[PDB]
From a paper:
Here, we study DHPS-3-dehydrogenase from Cupriavidus pinatubonensis (CpHpsN), a bacterium capable of utilizing DHPS as a sole carbon source. Kinetic analysis of CpHpsN reveals a strict preference for R-DHPS, catalyzing its 4-electron oxidation to R-SL, with high specificity for NAD+ over NADP+. CpHpsN forms a domain-swapped tight dimer with 28% of surface area buried at the dimer interface, with the interface featuring extensive hydrophobic and hydrogen-bond interactions. Domain 4 lies at the C-terminus and contributes to the active site and is also involved in dimerization through a metal binding site. Coordination of Zn2+ involves three residues from one monomer and one residue (His411*; * denotes the other monomer in the dimer) from the other monomer, showing that the enzyme forms an obligate dimer.
Crystals of the CpHpsN·Zn2+·NADH complex were obtained by soaking CpHpsN·Zn2+ crystals with NADH and diffracted to 2.24 Å. Attempts to soak the CpHpsN·Zn2+ crystals with high concentrations of NADH/NAD+, and SL or DHPS were unsuccessful to obtain a substrate or product bound complex. CpHpsN structures in both space groups contain a dimer in the asymmetric unit. No activity was detected for the D352A mutant of CpHpsN, most likely due to the inability to form a productive zinc-coordination complex with substrate. The 3D structure of the CpHpsN D352A mutant in complex with Zn2+ and NAD+ was solved and refined to 2.23 Å resolution and is essentially identical to the CpHpsN·Zn2+·NADH structure in the ‘open’ conformation.
Residue numbers in the entry:
A (entry chain A): 1 to 12, 15 to 361, 368 to 436
B (entry chain B): 2 to 8, 19 to 214, 225 to 358, 372 to 436
Amino acid sequence: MISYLKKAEKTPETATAQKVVTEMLAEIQARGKDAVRQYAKQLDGWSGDIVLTPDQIREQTKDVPAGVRADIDFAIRQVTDFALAQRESLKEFSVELHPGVTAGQRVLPVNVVGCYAPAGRYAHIASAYMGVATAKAAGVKTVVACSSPFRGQGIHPHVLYAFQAAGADVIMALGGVQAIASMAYGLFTGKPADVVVGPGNKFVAEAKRSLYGQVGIDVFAGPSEVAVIADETADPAIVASDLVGQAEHGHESPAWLFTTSRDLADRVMALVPELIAKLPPTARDAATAAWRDYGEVILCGTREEVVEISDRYASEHLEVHTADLDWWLANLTCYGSLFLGEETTVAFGDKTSGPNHVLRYSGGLSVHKFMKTLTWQQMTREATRQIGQVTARISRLEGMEAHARTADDRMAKYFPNASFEMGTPVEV
Amino acid sequence: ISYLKKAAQKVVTEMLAEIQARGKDAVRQYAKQLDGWSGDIVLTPDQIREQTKDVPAGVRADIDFAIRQVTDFALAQRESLKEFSVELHPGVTAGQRVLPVNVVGCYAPAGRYAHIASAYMGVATAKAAGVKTVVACSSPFRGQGIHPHVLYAFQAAGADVIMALGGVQAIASMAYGLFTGKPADVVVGPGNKFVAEAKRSLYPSEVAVIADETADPAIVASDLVGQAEHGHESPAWLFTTSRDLADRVMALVPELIAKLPPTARDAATAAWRDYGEVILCGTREEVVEISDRYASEHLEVHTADLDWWLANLTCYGSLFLGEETTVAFGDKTSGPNGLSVHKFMKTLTWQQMTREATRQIGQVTARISRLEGMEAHARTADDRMAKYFPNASFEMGTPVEV
Ligand SMILES: NC(=O)C1=CN([C@@H]2O[C@H](COP(=O)(O)OP(=O)(O)OC[C@H]3O[C@@H](n4cnc5c(N)ncnc54)[C@H](O)[C@@H]3O)[C@@H](O)[C@H]2O)C=CC1
Ligand SMILES: NC(=O)C1=CN([C@@H]2O[C@H](COP(=O)(O)OP(=O)(O)OC[C@H]3O[C@@H](n4cnc5c(N)ncnc54)[C@H](O)[C@@H]3O)[C@@H](O)[C@H]2O)C=CC1
Ligand SMILES: [Zn+2]
Ligand SMILES: [Zn+2]
């Protein structure tokens, strides 16, 4: 019953990014800080200090009024509070296996996280604090935050205030590849980043990919998304407002509506252009192109079919304006973050960032990105009695005589007056 | 700290391009051109039973035991990532689901000089994770099927589908879901470089020993020798505070190598020479630093105060704490190449709010959005405020004009 009442009237890289990064990294590897400063001057026209001091942080944010600060403080605490809860959800343990064998999981934060904040125009303050706040909540002891200098004065003061309030340990006025590489190689700080996070342009993305591989492109990149699942009980005016909400980001921001209600679909399709029409010019232009080219509406038969299509689309941000929200929570399986019910909405902000599904399911920005699970094992002598035998035999069946001797040596040492079937030794 | 001792992928684009277009046909085509395979790819309960009747009860009991040492750990590790609900700001509920992925592909090289553990580690781990479908591939052996040891392991580990199939054909089959109609959400298993770039496009061995003066240099030597015999590119490191032990070990390794059988003797000679390393350190604190920088896939710890090392070491694949256990007894997991239950599990986060909560959250959002010049965002807050609090007048920020 899947019917595209409105369809994607467009489709979603370059080697250009690769060239620059490779050349730029090669150079920064060679020259270090001097190359970084040079790129800063050539690219950003910047000649100031790189590492901010407590005083310059305090000075450059002194015109941010108490009311703006209080709001950012509030938004940041939300992220922190979810992040602390999420950290407690990954436990350490030990377990007895074969008698005399103990095995376990240690859980520890990485030492150093680098956070980049694009601090351009059409970017949320949230981008500055989400990485930093999450890393600190994870228990990462050192967080380096970078953002390109805004208009010659330094870091955009909101971004800078957000860095400080979120708990960044070191702040640096650097943009682009040279920021990513400095954080990665530990320039200016002497603490190489175990991971680097944060959105940016193709160059920042490519820099992360090159330096970190899979843990550098596993967080949601590209333009802002929004998906809404809605049945007959949903309110079309709200639904349409929520799509238009993320569509003002730019001309490539996808806004999807999956619904089991033709009536809703029709009303939303009608309401959206009216709402766009009443935006201020910048947003009006952004949203028109955004909805025109990338807006989709999918009428489905049953709930199950909505689950299928939503899981396929795997929206970074997914609202559920339906009855029986418990069902939808229990059945949906691929999305970035879920907004259950009408009350919450995407613009209230994420608690985590979802994976880069446009490449698939794995990664994202949460405390889990900043934590290592290490496994260990330990045995009594007694336990080896059984395990040594098995390993010797299996080893000699694999043709691994050296492996077997590791068991033989232990069997000999731990059980001197004992006979054991340790397999037939390898003669080839 | 002082160093004593020191040290195509284009057929993938085409083969995939051909499998994408032609599907199952291309896989059976590629099967005879690279392996000469005639029969169907998908085995059946009978073929699996027939082909594993040659394996004795004592061998099976060994493999079964070894799988239980993996499975039982994996089961515990699965429960270590919890689902939860939490209240933040009053009336804000938020939480985390933990879901197995749907289908995992496992690939085992049926070759010799490989561990049987290769075949069961992925399969068993995926099953303990709660994954409902595990597809398992392994390259045939001279038109005679999969090595019965690999096949028995697959089955005993709890594979749902077993497919005799190799290389890029295997990976792509599993990844597109040819023969089963079930695309794997992830594929795992060692293989050749074709296998590797096949994994890269769609989606050596090691050992280290930390030891102090209380270590038994014979055992330390033997353990280094144990994994050396894999190949000429298997590193075998020693980090120690004891020059004495450092020497006796460097002395006794060659004597153990020399006493090995033919293939293993020369395998270890190259490796221990080319890649073997030794590092003497003044303090424990120093050894931690160096171990962490190397991050061995397998790391043994033969010292006093094993707790301290458990507490302070922070980078490795698998830790073997104390003398008694040893690399050869097997991993519970694989470090980064890592393989664990966590690899096969999604977290999904969600939030829900009362109307009361949006009183404060909505007006903060409207003010921030409008500083960011995001008028439409702010209007999602406005609309909620008008619907839930009809006569309210909160500071929702100055509307954007630009
Ligand atoms: N709408 C969303 O969902 C958001 C996404 N993002 C993304 O962040 C992006 C921001 O990009 P920008 O404004 O450029 O900020 P940015 O901070 O990511 O990049 C600026 C830096 O890029 C460097 N750079 C620019 N062109 C270069 C070139 N040709 N070679 C080398 N270095 C170069 C500059 O020197 C500067 O240091 C947006 O395009 C957006 O896609 C960020 C915020 C929100
Ligand atoms: N210590 C480690 O890191 C371990 C990794 N390994 C690796 O497993 C591999 C074992 O190699 P094999 O036993 O041969 O198994 P393999 O993984 O190389 O698979 C063999 C299959 O490759 C395919 N193939 C052969 N020639 C091809 C070609 N020209 N183009 C495309 N596909 C082709 C065929 O289907 C054949 O059945 C080695 O690379 C070894 O290093 C072994 C297990 C442990
Ligand atoms: Zn937004
Ligand atoms: Zn081995």
